[PDB]
RNA sequence: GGGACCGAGGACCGCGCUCUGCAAGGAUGCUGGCGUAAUGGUCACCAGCGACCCGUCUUGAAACACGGACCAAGGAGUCAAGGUUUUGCGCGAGUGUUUGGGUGUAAAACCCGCACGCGUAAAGGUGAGAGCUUCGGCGCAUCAUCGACCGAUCCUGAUGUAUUCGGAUGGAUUUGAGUAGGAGCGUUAAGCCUUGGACCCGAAAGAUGGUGAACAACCAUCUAGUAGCUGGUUACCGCCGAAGUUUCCCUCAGGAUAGCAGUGUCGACCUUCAGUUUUAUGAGGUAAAGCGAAUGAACUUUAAAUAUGUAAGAAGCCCUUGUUACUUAACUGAACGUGGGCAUUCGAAUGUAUCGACACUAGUGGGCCAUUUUUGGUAAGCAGAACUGGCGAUGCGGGAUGAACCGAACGCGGGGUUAAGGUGCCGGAGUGGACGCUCAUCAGACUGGCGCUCAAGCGUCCCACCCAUACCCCGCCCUCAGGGUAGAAACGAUGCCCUGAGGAGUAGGCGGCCGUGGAGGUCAGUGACGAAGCCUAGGGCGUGAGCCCGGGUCGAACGGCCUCUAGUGCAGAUCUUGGUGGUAGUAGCAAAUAUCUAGCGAAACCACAG
RNA sequence: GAGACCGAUAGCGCACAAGUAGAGUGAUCGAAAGAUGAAAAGCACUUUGAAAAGAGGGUUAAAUAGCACGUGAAAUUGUUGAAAGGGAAGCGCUUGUGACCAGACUUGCGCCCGGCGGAUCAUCCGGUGUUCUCACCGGUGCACUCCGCCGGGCUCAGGCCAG
């Protein structure tokens, strides 16, 4: 008789959607990135970057 | 359609019980003789004997001919076979030559207590123009 | 609208102002969306704007008719043999274009957007190219979609 | 030939029938248990009928016709009186109408509770006139 | 976190969840207020915004023109006969009692003896195909194809023949309003056509018979004559809705056919269909690049852009073999008989609220503007072709009025957001921001007026804001469509319940409903304790035509419902009759009854006003 | 003798003085016009004055039915009251002001005691009609049950609008 949104109304959204409630608790959604020293860029792609 | 043209109460009794069957039940045969009930008079042309026993030849001389329409006397058949026939309306002689032969001559409303779904059962259409 | 664009808009289901449908990208789909291009404007969208179409503005097309996608039994019953059982697989069926595409994306009725919430460009009946919003804007059709959603 | 009866009764004339411009037809028989012409409530077209009467002593009866006395409109209706206590004449009621229309059943119980509320404002009203003399 | 708008439904059922009950298939709880007035309504006035005088006719559209002093009553597609289509009904190879006779409670009703009108008479194979099935099959109506018979026609020309008659056998590219298991008769309702006054009103005439005079005229009738051409043609609501073109024939003064809209039947049914893309393909190798490849836009390895035909499997494919009336030297091809396997990518995309055939029925045959391509001319405009989009038949937002053009197409409301266009004031929203230019003795304005000059001008860029009948969410109305509803329902199955989509409209088509006079039935209807009518700065219902009640007047009849019937609905026709006005106590004292002042006293004209 | 006819602008031109009044030399043409009240009981008498007129007064159920006569619309007009206006009025949507009018939910039920009176209560008696097992009378009494009426007590439900 009345349709409710799934993202304003949490239990339309766990009816449809039953991993929204481990989604939000486990934090998927604020995932970090992968952890080490990253390597820095190449000098052949900045000559290449700033040219004539 | 939502309504038969024909003022007779009976046909709409008829229609009322043939809605419900086909409404009610998986066979064709009450639809199709629902839409033949809604159908006018032009478009549901006499039957004659002579067509029935016509048709009534390879191995359906034990089914019972369905006929939405009159069923009417035909002076050319010299002799009427056994035949058990459900229609609207029977002309007095086509009723009397029926049951003289050993027939029998039913109404849609004895078919549809007696055939639900149409086991076994001969419809016949008569000829168009 | 000339016969032939309208005959386009007709066969993609545009058949009303600010209506968005799902097109997987062929080069037959691709060449018409290129002939009503004065009428539309399309592009690439990210997994929010799919999901919040599906979730928010989601309707389906049962038996001709526009039902709400307020559970998974219509989704089931509608899709179940396609192996499309919940609104999740609509999703991922949507945004990964997979197998069964032509039913998914069929199966949703035309998206019924709003006028966006900020407005358009000011000239908006000239490229996007131009300074406009016909045409292909690609990965800016997401902010488009967050004001028309 | 209830349906036949009903059909000339409802599509073509009824003596009984008040038709009204907003959006209800009403029944002006006697025995009819809700004073709406319709198929369920038509005393005419049903054979096996029943209502509920109020006689001027004040006695409430429950009348009931059946199809086998149809042809003696003199011996149409058996009058059964019904209890004072409310809930005896609610069971009674249950009792005589067993096997019904459950349409019948409610509507005989909604008539039943009706007069009762009736008789008791009237004999409140009856009590205020006699006080205040107007 | 702050704000606005909304609360549809009404026992339970379902999906769920943070599970002793919850924000999970639509608002409850608490407090306060309400009768010397909560809340409405009517009239008058003021105020903000909006708004060209109605009907007819012509034009592509306007513009002109016609009619309109006012009110009451009257006022126009009717009735017959004959055809034709469709709905209902009775009987049915038959049908029709009503010329007439008998009978009667007497123009009613009831009965029918012989005729007569119209109609009827004088079953084959194969393949699809609704339906049924004992799962093996049987197969309606109808269609296609192969066959059968007949009136009659073309030869071959039997036994026979009265000796000049006949047609047996085998052959034909034969026909038919032919057969192949009858559909008609009567009646009712609606529509159309022909003729009668013929939807209503409107000539010059002509004829017949009379009346007068004095150098043809008038009267009555035929006659409601007729031809064109005008004017007019009477309640509401809902649903669907155009064309102003192809072809043919012949009068000029035009019809027929098809097209656009609609109805019924049959066949399938998302099979199939498509103003569409893609693939191959047609006319443009048209542009381009290269010719350190050849050759010479006509050069080309490659190849645009741009539009437009054809095909995309089951109604299909391929190949092999016989026949034929055909064809060619010849299965050289064509048709009729062959065989095989492919129903789990059955052979691109996307859409599919469907399409084809048959039959029947109204309104229409203007032109104009713009675009694309093409040809020719002029001092320049311009002229000839095809194309779609619109107007006629369209309201709304902008556009300085209009119109064109831009946006966007319309049920009644609330909220939100925009399009085109705008944000100095009129005028809702920025005297917003960055960079430059311009002082014009009537600058310029993506100016209308006021007015503006480090703009309120011009060019670009950025941000916020304003509002359409447009979009989104909710409510309500109607229509259409889908679904449910019987050992019956808690509502007339012509009822009820659930769900979705849609809503412009002239000519025109269909349905529903309101009102008037009279008739049959009914309401055991209202009424001299007051019917009908009329008046009414009262109360309600209906979207509406309308309907119901109150107050006053009044004095004899009247109303609802179901059917029947019609002289049945008015704003107009230089409409008819009656009544009444401005002009106007004016012009003038005139037929009837040279000024000032008593008494008397019009007419033209009149949509409303300058 | 009748009618699914017309009902005084209709129905014959004529419901009444109707082929009349009237027009034309003539042949001919040709209207308009019905309704007091049941009964004239048709307004006596007094008083203005020269009127087809008033004021008192009377008849009548009624005279705002008075031979202008049943009812008495609109156009148009006068008196009184209120409001507005002088380079058009009139209309659509929306508030406001003044005047007038209406008057919101028709505003109830259930329990617990005490008294009283009836009954469908009494396996009480008698009678009547019946669909023959259901109704209706007459007479008895309050052990039980059920209804009412009166005096106290309590709970609940209630229409609309705001926060
Ligand atoms: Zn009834």
Known sequence: ?52 | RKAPKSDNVYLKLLVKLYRFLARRTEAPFNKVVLRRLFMSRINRPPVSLSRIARNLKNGNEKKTVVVVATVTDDNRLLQVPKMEVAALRFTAKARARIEAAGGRTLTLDQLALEKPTGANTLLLRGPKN | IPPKPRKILQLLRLRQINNGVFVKVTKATAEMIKIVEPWVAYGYPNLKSVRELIYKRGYGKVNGQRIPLTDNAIIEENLGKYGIICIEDLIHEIFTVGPNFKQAANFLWPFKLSNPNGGFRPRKFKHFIEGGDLGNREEHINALIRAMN | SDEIVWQIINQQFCAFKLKTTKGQNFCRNEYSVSGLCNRQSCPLANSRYATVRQSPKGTIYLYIKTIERSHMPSKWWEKIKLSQNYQKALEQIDQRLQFFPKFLIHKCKQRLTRLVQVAIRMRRIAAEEARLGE
């Open chain 1, 1 to 52: 008789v009345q349709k409710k949104n799934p993202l304003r109304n949490k239990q339309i959204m766990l009816r449809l959607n039953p991993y929204a409630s481990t989604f939000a608790k486990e934090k998927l959604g604020e995932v970090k990135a992968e952890e080490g020293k990253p390597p820095k860029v190449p000098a052949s792609f900045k000559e290449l970057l700033h040219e004539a």
